[PDB]
Amino acid sequence: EVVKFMDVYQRSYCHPIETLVDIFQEYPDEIEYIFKPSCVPLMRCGGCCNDEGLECVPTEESNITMQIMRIKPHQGQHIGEMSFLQHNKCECRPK
Amino acid sequence: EVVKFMDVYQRSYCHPIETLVDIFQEYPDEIEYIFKPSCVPLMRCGGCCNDEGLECVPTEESNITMQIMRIKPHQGQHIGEMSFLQHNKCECRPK
Amino acid sequence: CDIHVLWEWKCFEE
């Protein structure tokens, strides 16, 4: 009925979380394209720190490669591999 | 070592997803105060639709109540119930 | 394959 404080606190605190990201944000030199899907699920730091003086930042990263459909003018539909950055570890640090 | 197309497409498609939301983002009029945690995990529609002319919107919503701390300088610590909007069902609909 | 509904593979071949 009510989410208890320590549960809310632990679940909200800075950590890698599945985040839906637009592919254009990750591939800015490809904004001429239409992608399918147009967004991908990525592990990315999220949540809050104990202070307005701290920010939640990645401290360990890796890549993941996904099959994405891509089309642009004067091209037909292609499927290709696109790599994305994931966050494996996050920490709270001064801004 | 490559995520297959149909798996990325299904995982990215419009659906309720756990989202970490800043309590001020929900309640800008509360920005004078300090909350602990300062963000809460909420189910919110996320992901992408088959066409940038559709948008992922909720078709079922509910309130969730959480135990949150709030305080002001040179003041007692408060703990209390705070309610937030969650999204229970999402669909792709014209913008 | 309605544009407003999650698609199966067949859709992406049309």
Numbering used by the authors:
A (entry chain V), B (entry chain W): 13 to 107
C (entry chain P): 1 to 14
Task: Please give the exact wording used by the authors of the publication that reports this structure.
In the present work, we focus on a class of monocyclic disulfide‐containing 19 amino acid peptides targeting the Vascular Endothelial Growth Factor‐A, the main pro‐angiogenic factor in Human. We proposed to use this peptide as a model to rationalize the thermodynamics of α‐helix stabilization by an i to i+4 lactam bridge. Around 950 Å2 of accessible surface area (ASA) was buried at the peptide‐VEGF interface, that overlapped with the VEGF receptor 1 domain 2 (VEGFR1‐d2)‐binding site. Although only lactam‐bridged ExxxK, DxxxK and KxxxD induced the formation of stable helix in the unbound state, all peptides of the series were helically folded when bound to VEGF.
Constraints caused by the lactam bridges and by the binding of the macro‐cyclized peptide to the VEGF site also made the α‐helices non‐canonical: in each of the four peptides, the residues P8‐11 folded into a 310‐helix characterized by a H‐bond between Glu P8 O and Cys P11 HN. The helix of peptide 4 c (KxxxE) was longer (residues P8 to P14) with a H‐bond network similar to peptide 2 c. In contrast, the helix of peptide 4 c was poorly defined in the electronic density (RSCC=0.76). In the 4 c peptide, the lactam bridge cyclization forced Lys P14 to rotate along phi angle (ϕLys,P14=−47°), which prevented any folding of the P15 residue into the helix. Indeed, crystal structure and NMR data evidenced that the C‐terminus part of the 4 c helix was poorly structured, making it the most dynamic among the bicyclic peptides. Although P10 and P14 residues were in standard rotamer conformation, the constraints due to the lactam bridge destabilized the helix fold and acted as helix breaker at the P15 residue. On the contrary, the monocyclic peptides 1, 2, 3 and 4, and the peptide 4 c had little secondary structure: they displayed a weak maximum at 190 nm, a negative minimum at 204–205 nm followed by a positive slope reaching zero at around 225 nm and forming a small positive peak around 228 nm.
